Amino acid sequence: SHMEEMIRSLQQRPEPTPEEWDLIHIATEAHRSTNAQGSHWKQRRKFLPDDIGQSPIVSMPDGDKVDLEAFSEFTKIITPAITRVVDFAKKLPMFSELPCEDQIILLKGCCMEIMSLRAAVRYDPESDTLTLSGEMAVKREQLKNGGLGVVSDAIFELGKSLSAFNLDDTEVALLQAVLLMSTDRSGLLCVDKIEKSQEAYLLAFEHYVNHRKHNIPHFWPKLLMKVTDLRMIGACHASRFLHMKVECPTELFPPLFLEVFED
Template structure:
């Protein structure tokens, strides 16, 4: 290990052109910045031995040794220069950060021609089967506040259900399922699969896609989700209407997704990813479905 050329303590690096410890570096810097050396005086005619034990006993001899070994006074910055240097360092750091960010944006792959075709097909399928489209906020109807606020009828597994809320939800569940099926059938790669696999995929993804479609229509102001593009419900109404703890998961997803402000294409691609889940039990065309899902994932990654 290197030793401080002033006091012999363990050195921490080059400071003001000399290898020194932190203590001698700080002492030298303070002395110059505050112009203290004229006030220093030695009691022993300037003949003190400076080491790590005695260095604090005589400031004059310590400073003399600093200059004797070659520590450069001109390298010590005053307050204004030090602040200017710090500002310059921060500006350079920020510039490097912006450059790195710009480089990331520039090097991020754009969707290929084939992926743009896929994106167009999926987006069109979603738009054609997404109730009320972008006008859902204007067309939604809020479920009356007195419906679904408290569970009133016993249900299996020690649950309770508000029958009026349950009745309202059952009216929209069939059209919501039909829209998911229509979405899938508008994707050529889905239609290429055997009927058995189509049925398995739809059974597996139907609730997931309906939940996603509801979640992206979370409204923070009213704290509601809009189901099937028409019925706005609160967390308690959804829970007491028969969905139980699942309602919390859908609402929590809605809160999370609201920060991303997903567009229709991003939602469409996410739905396609959910649809083409190759891990559904009983599938025959696992590899093909896996390949389809990978294509949607890559298109999503390159699109965002």
């Protein structure tokens, strides 16, 4: 119609359908309601003390040693952070309608990917820190030494790079949904359903990106490349975590931390 043509005049690229907009809205709100500190994170965060995370003392196979005190500080707050990812997932209809066993598998498969993304979008250029759970600002060396090793470098590099993308809450939520609904995991029942859900999120996401009209060229494939980086972060973390478990006693690991990663 004439009105449609008028408001779509400066559009070319496909916009979200009314169905995709519903999908987009639910995911955005699921993220906002489970994202710690919302928009008050820069005012509310406190820095991890500088005398913490300077003393790596416990050996690891790759030679990046672990600072036990720093490791303790990070794990003290990891349980509520993991809980929030589960809270997010539970709010997506396509996730909550899966068999319980599939839900657990998907959560374990994407948990580090999502937490790292949530840290990375709160990279702060002026202090050169990430913010963990919207409350702990950490430096590169601290997060490296407290257990993550080279995984810390990778997350900081992602966070630095994401600054120019100016992602909004919707874009973050949709990245999360895409990470969540992956079938690259063993033991899933509803493979086809999970893939169709990921495809629906991906297409809504591509269309939302069109709607946003970012200033950066080639935005969509650039963001897809970031998904691959998050995947590699997740994989490096899974490997390092196995090593952590070999080196350190169970008592240093919160129960939920072990459960999500012990796979």
